[PDB]
Structures are given as structure tokens and as C-alpha cells.
Design an enzyme around this catalytic site. Structure first.
Site, PDB file in Angstrom:
ATOM      1  N   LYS A  63       7.818   4.233  15.016  1.00 16.82           N
ATOM      2  CA  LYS A  63       6.699   3.429  15.492  1.00 16.82           C
ATOM      3  C   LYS A  63       6.660   2.061  14.820  1.00 16.82           C
ATOM      4  CE  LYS A  63       3.768   7.281  16.936  1.00 16.82           C
ATOM      5  NZ  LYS A  63       4.877   8.269  16.801  1.00 16.82           N
ATOM      6  N   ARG A 174     -26.663  -3.617  -4.926  1.00 15.65           N
ATOM      7  CA  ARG A 174     -25.729  -4.631  -5.400  1.00 15.65           C
ATOM      8  C   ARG A 174     -26.066  -6.007  -4.819  1.00 15.65           C
ATOM      9  NH1 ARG A 174     -21.815  -0.951  -3.410  1.00 15.65           N
ATOM     10  NH2 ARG A 174     -20.818  -2.665  -2.256  1.00 15.65           N
TER      11      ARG A 174
END
Ligand code: NA
Ligand code: NA
Ligand code: NA
Length: 326
Positions: A63, A174
Site C-alpha cells: 500500500k 490548561r
DNA sequence: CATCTG
DNA sequence: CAGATG
């Protein structure tokens, strides 16, 4: 990204095998291949070069050859066009509908959201809620709204019992500008690791948030974990806020700050911190920090009364949540 | 992992 | 109880 094309391709194939084929081993293989190639320092020029790496075999090398040679992968083109594959991917965007349920629905001729709405009788409670708020749940929550939600949660929790400790974690903690949902960590001094799970601790908070009409629906609810839906209030004649996903986890007081650290992230930061802990002879997980013997023996959970305590054990300068990007 | 479904 | 789900 040096080999982003290849890793994107593999990840797409991974998701296909997981969501459509339900082939766990192919899913695992594609994921492992993507991870290894991502760490590879060179621009891959052939399938043969990639095959030298652990986790990359004949089929994946093939692939890679096609993608490098043609700039595309026929298989992926076929998949994107495929009616059944597309329907499955769509259905699995509804909270509560996984690969198994999606397969079942698509087999039954249910292929679109409108089909689901016309067949709501075939859906469980979670799936009906996911469908009802399909749009809202895919929306981002602006920090501004997360702050309004936090203000309600913290103040109602405090109202139930001033001894509760509640912390909204995730990227929001955060300082993120937007969140995907709200993750609340809850604890109470009367709840520790050894004692029996007290059902009313979580229930009373959920009940109060329902009473003030903040929590609107329940997806799941046990002694330690609540998953549900909430919505900010609005004044008569002003457009309503979207419905949002909220989780509330009741955690033993003695494991709370380890839980806070873990669910605050980021993932990279956690990975780095746990790594440095090992160097210093400590092992950190979601629940505890324990001394790690040279023989690999794990000591008993060390006392933790704050996130800083954890940083101290491993001789790290305390890091504010906003500086925990990595 | 904790919880739900049938 | 197994399987599924977030
Ligand atoms: Na889903
Ligand atoms: Na908005
Ligand atoms: Na099994």
C-alpha cells in the site's frame, strides 16, 4: 510531518477495519504501523524501506508503494465512496452508537440520521439522547461558556456540602480556548480507597445539579461515575445554549490529586512525567505514586495532599496546568 | 474502567 | 452473564 501522508493513510485504514470490518487484528496492525513510521527519522521512498520496520509487513509495504507511486490508494477511494462504509461512519457519530450498533442498523436499512429518527424505537436511551443532541454534541464549547458551567457546578457542589472538592479538568484546566466536553473530578474526605463505595456522595451532587435544571439528561450513573447532559440557563426570549456532555467522577480523597494530574494532561506531558518518575525510582499512574524498587517491586501508595506533592517526590519544579503542554 | 442492555 | 460503549 515527514511521513504524514503514509501515517494518515494507515490511520484511515485502521479506522475502517475498526468501524466497518470490525477486524481487531487489522486495526491493531495498521495502528502499530502508523506509530512506528511516525517515529521514523527519514522520508520513506518505498514500501521496501518501510518493511524494514517492526510492524510493517508485505501488505502495508504494498500500500505504501501504491501511495508513493500514484499519490493515492484505490482501496481508500473505494471505501470513501462505499455506501455501507459511509453510513456506518455517520451512524457512529451518534453518542451510544458504536461499530456494532451501526452495523446492525445499516443491515436493517437504517443509513441516515433521518432514518434513526423514524426508528427511534430501535434505539436505547443513550442512543436516543445522542441522536436528539447530535448537532450540539459535535460543537466545541467556548472557554467563556466552560467558565459559566464551572461557576454553576462549583457553587452548587459547595451548597450540598462545603467539604466536597470539585475540579474541572481536561484541556480547559490548561487554559484551552475551547473544550469538547466538561470533565469534573469530585472527592470528599469521607471517601477513601479502602472504605466501601458510598452511593449518596455522587448522587447528591447530581441531584442538586438536576434540581437547578443544569443537568438535563442522564446517560449513565453509578456510585463513582456519572455521564450525562447539561445546559446553561437562558432568559425568556433569548436563544437557548447548546446541550453539552458532562462527566462527573467521584474519586477517593487519597487518590484525588493523582487523578487530577492524570485527567488534566496533556497526554504528552503525562507520558514525560511518568517517564521522569521512573528515573527517580517512582511509578505514577491515575491513582497513586509509589516508590519503584530496583527489583521492580512497587512500594505502597505515598501520601499525596496536592499536585505539588507529586512533583516534589520526583524532584520536579511545580508546573502550572497551563504549562503542561508537554 | 464503570456502566448499561437484553 | 457477554458484549458494547464512552
Ligand atoms: Na458513537
Ligand atoms: Na457558541
Ligand atoms: Na471476548
Amino acid at each position: 510531518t515527514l511521513n504524514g501522508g503514509i501515517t494518515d493513510m494507515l490511520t484511515e485504514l485502521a479506522n475502517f477495519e475498526k468501524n466497518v470490518s470490525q477486524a481487531i487484528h487489522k486495526y491493531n496492525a495498521y495502528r502499530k504501523a502508523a506509530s512506528v513510521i511516525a517515529k521514523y527519522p527519514h522520508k520513506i521512498k518505498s514500501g521496501a524501506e518501510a518493511k524494514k520496520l517492526p510492524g510493517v509487513g508485505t501488505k502495508i509495504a504494498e500500500k505504501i508503494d501504491e501511495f508513493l507511486a500514484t499519490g493515492k490508494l484505490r482501496k481508500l477511494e473505494k471505501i470513501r465512496q462505499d455506501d455501507t462504509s459511509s453510513s456506518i461512519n455517520l451512524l457512529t457519530r451518534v453518542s451510544g452508537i458504536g461499530p456494532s450498533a451501526a452495523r446492525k442498523f445499516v443491515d436493517e436499512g437504517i443509513k441516515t440520521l433521518e432514518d434513526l429518527r423514524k426508528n427511534e424505537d430501535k434505539l436505547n436511551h443513550h442512543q436516543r439522547i445522542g441522536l436528539k443532541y447530535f448537532g450540539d454534541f459535535e460543537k466545541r464549547i467556548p472557554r467563556e461558556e466552560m467558565l459559566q458551567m464551572q461557576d454553576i457546578v462549583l457553587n452548587e457542589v459547595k451548597k450540598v456540602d462545603s467539604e466536597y472538592i470539585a475540579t474541572v479538568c481536561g484541556s480547559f484546566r490548561r487554559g484551552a480556548e475551547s473544550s469538547g466536553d466538561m470533565d469534573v473530578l469530585l472527592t470528599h474526605p469521607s471517601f477513601t480507597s479502602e472504605s466501601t463505595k458510598q452511593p449518596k456522595l455522587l448522587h447528591q451532587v447530581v441531584e442538586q445539579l438536576q434540581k437547578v435544571h443544569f443537568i438535563t439528561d442522564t446517560l449513565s450513573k453509578g456510585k463513582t461515575k456519572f455521564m450525562g447532559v447539561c445546559q446553561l440557563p437562558s432568559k425568556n426570549d433569548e436563544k437557548e445554549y447548546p446541550h453539552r456532555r458532562i462527566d462527573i467522577r467521584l474519586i477517593p480523597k487519597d487518590q484525588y490529586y493523582c487523578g487530577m494530574l492524570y485527567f488534566t494532561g496533556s497526554d504528552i506531558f503525562n507520558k514525560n512525567m511518568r517517564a521522569h518518575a521512573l528515573e527517580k525510582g517512582f511509578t505514577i499512574n491515575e491513582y497513586t505514586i509509589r516508590p519503584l524498587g530496583v527489583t521492580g517491586v512497587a512500594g505502597e501508595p505515598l501520601p499525596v495532599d496536592s499536585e505539588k506533592d507529586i512533583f516534589d517526590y520526583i524532584q520536579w519544579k511545580y508546573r502550572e496546568p497551563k504549562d503542561r503542554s508537554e
